[PDB]
Amino acid sequence: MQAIKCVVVGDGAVGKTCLLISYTTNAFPGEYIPTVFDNYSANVMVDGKPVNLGLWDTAGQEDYDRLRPLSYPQTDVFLICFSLVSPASFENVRAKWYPEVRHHCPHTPILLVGTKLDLRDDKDTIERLRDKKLAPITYPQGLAMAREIGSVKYLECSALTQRGLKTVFDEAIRAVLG
Amino acid sequence: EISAPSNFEHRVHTGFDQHEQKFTGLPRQWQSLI
Numbered sequence: 001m002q003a004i005k006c007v008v009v010g011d012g013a014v015g016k017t018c019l020l021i022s023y024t025t026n027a028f029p030g031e032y033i034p035t036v037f038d039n040y041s042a043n044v045m046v047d048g049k050p051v052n053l054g055l056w057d058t059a060g061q062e063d064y065d066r067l068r069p070l071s072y073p074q075t076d077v078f079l080i081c082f083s084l085v086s087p088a089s090f091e092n093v094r095a096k097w098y099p100e101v102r103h104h105c106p107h108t109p110i111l112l113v114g115t116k117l118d119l120r121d122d123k124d125t126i127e128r129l130r131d132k133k134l135a136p137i138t139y140p141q142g143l144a145m146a147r148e149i150g151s152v153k154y155l156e157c158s159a160l161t162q163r164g165l166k167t168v169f170d171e172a173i174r175a176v177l178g
Numbered sequence: 179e180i181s182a183p184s185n186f187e188h189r190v191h192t193g194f195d196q197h198e199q200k201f202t203g204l205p206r207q208w209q210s211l212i
């Protein structure tokens with residue numbers, strides 16, 4: 001059976017675990033529990049052929065910076081994630097995640113993933129962002145960042161509503177298998 | 179086309195013990211590395 005190693009990285013609180021668990025199990029986790037490291041597997045049928053999708057759920061916590069790269073050898077595709085309602089997580093795509101990934105895997109494809117799309121129009125979120133001199137990241141801004149890091153695809157999704165969710169993983173798969 | 183995923187499996191669940199400052203449930207391959 002074909003197999004794909006997909007590794008997921010990004011800041012704390014961005015939604016990496018909810019994204020993986022919502023796609024694989026169709027449930028949105030009820031509790032916010034930061035990850036040390038987890039590995040999930042799921043089967044997917046791709047053009048009639050079964051494919052084994054291996055998912056490497058990494059720690060956004062800086063304190064686990066030395067554990068994180070142990071996931072990287074032989075990776076087939078990276079999802080670098082940031083929250084569409086955290087400018088700081090987005091700035092860290094450039095500042096931290098792209099450089100770290102690319103240092104360990106100089107030619108592995110990267111998909112840029114904007115998470116929490118359900119919150120970009122949440123008036124309270126917008127207001128509290130505005131209070132801190134911030135605004136949600138827009139599609140064009142996301143796409144510009146993706147182009148700058150040489151990503152194969154920029155995708156937006158919500159783990160909570162599953163809008164755009166399957167597409168993230170479908171594209172990740174097509175990025176590796178064609 | 180690409181189907182919905184099926185047959186989820188949680189293969190590895192790693193934690194950290196603050197008393198010993200040691201990881202717990204490490205992938206068997208990482209035990210010589212960390």
Ligand SMILES: Nc1nc2c(ncn2[C@@H]2O[C@H](COP(=O)(O)OP(=O)(O)CP(=O)(O)O)[C@@H](O)[C@H]2O)c(=O)[nH]1
Nearest residue numbers: 013014015016017018032034035060116158159160
């Ligand atoms: N509104 C909304 N909230 C989300 C979404 N995805 C995750 N969250 C919320 O964001 C927080 C972080 O989610 P989590 O999946 O744990 O993030 P993570 O990136 O795995 C955190 P770590 O890197 O520490 O494991 C939680 O409060 C969770 O409920 C989403 O699509 N929409």
Ligand SMILES: [Cl-]
Nearest residue numbers: 146151152153
């Ligand atoms: Cl692009």
Ligand SMILES: [Cl-]
Nearest residue numbers: 156157163164
């Ligand atoms: Cl969308």
Ligand SMILES: [Mg+2]
Nearest residue numbers: 016017034035
């Ligand atoms: Mg997590």
